[PDB]
Amino acid sequence: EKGIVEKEGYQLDTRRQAQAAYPRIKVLVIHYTADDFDSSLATLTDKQVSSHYLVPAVPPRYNGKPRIWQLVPEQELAWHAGISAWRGATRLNDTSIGIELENRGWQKSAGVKYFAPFEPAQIQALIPLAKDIIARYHIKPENVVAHADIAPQRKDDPGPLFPWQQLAQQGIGAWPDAQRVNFYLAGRAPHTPVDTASLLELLARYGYDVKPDMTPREQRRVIMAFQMHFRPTLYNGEADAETQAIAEALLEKYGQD
Amino acid sequence: XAXK
Q1: Dist. CA A21–CA A98, nearest whole Å
Q2: CATH fold of A23-173, please?
Q3: From CA A104, how far away is CA A168, in angstroms rounded?
Q4: Is the peptide bond preceding residue A158 cis, with omega within 30 degrees of 0?
Q5: CB < 8 Å to B4, chain A
């Protein structure tokens, strides 16, 4: 009937819709696989981890379009985030979509952890899928994140070679206004040392997991995670003026929720 | 990467 639904035991009347109704999905998490396509597909369909999408390094094309693998209906959670925290939330699996990108990650080469560049074909395939996802759920720019952002002590992915600024120019994810980063730099050289505690407060509020008593090591991983995303020219995890100014400009533009 |  007119807005009425039948069931075993009861009728539902759907005629009155509440104003306060919002997606359960709020977060888009970017990963790399650190493994080849067939191997990643095997792993992400097994019983320990999964993701909603798997993008090959160079997706095959059909009907003039890159093909991407969907492993898990978006309505359902995938096992991609693990133990995690972002902007007040935990258990990020519950509220996120996870995209896995076939990419080798890091390999230590004479002690120097070297990351692998992202195939431009892959990024090109990613853009329309991210846009559709972001439209569908009205995902806010600051909630397009790296796995490292939501689990900084455990993960680096997708790493400092991931083109966040390029994506931001396509309307995908958060990026600070350059004039405001300069404003907050406030006359300092970019690498001028800044007070670690003060920087960590800002990162906490922007959304990073920061606990009251952390070893220097653990404080470095948080700052490093932030730099890999937002200041990838140097991601050694030391608090400096440029890192702080970026955090300050991000907070000004996107807030904290 | 991934990773319940």
Answers
A1: 23
A2: Lysozyme-like (3.40.80)
A3: 23
A4: yes
A5: 48-49, 79, 82, 93
The coordinates were experimentally obtained by X-ray
User: A52 CB near a chain B CB, below 8 Å?
Assistant: no
Q: How far is CA A130 from CA A52, A55, A112, A121, A141, in A?
A: 12, 12, 32, 15, 11
Using a CB-CB cut-off of 8 Å, the residues of chain A touching B3 are 48-49, 79-80, 82
- The answer to whether the CB of A242 falls within 8 A of the CB of A191 is yes
Domain with CATH 1.10.101.10 in chain A: 174-257
The enclosing H or E element of A4 equals: strand A4-6
CATH 3.40.80.10 domain range(s) in chain A: 23-173
Distance between CA atoms of residues A156 and A148, nearest Å: 5
Burial class (CB in 10 A: 0-12, 13-18, 19+), A170: middle
Q: Which CATH class is domain A174-257?
A: mainly alpha
Q: Which residue of A has its CA nearest to B1?
A: A33
DSSP states of A180-219 as a string?
Answer: HHHHHHTT--TT-B--HHHHHHHHHHHT----SS--HHHH
Q: Is A31 annotated as a binding residue?
A: yes
A33 annotated among ligand-binding-site residues: yes
Resolution, Å (one decimal): 1.8
3-state secondary structure of A133: helix
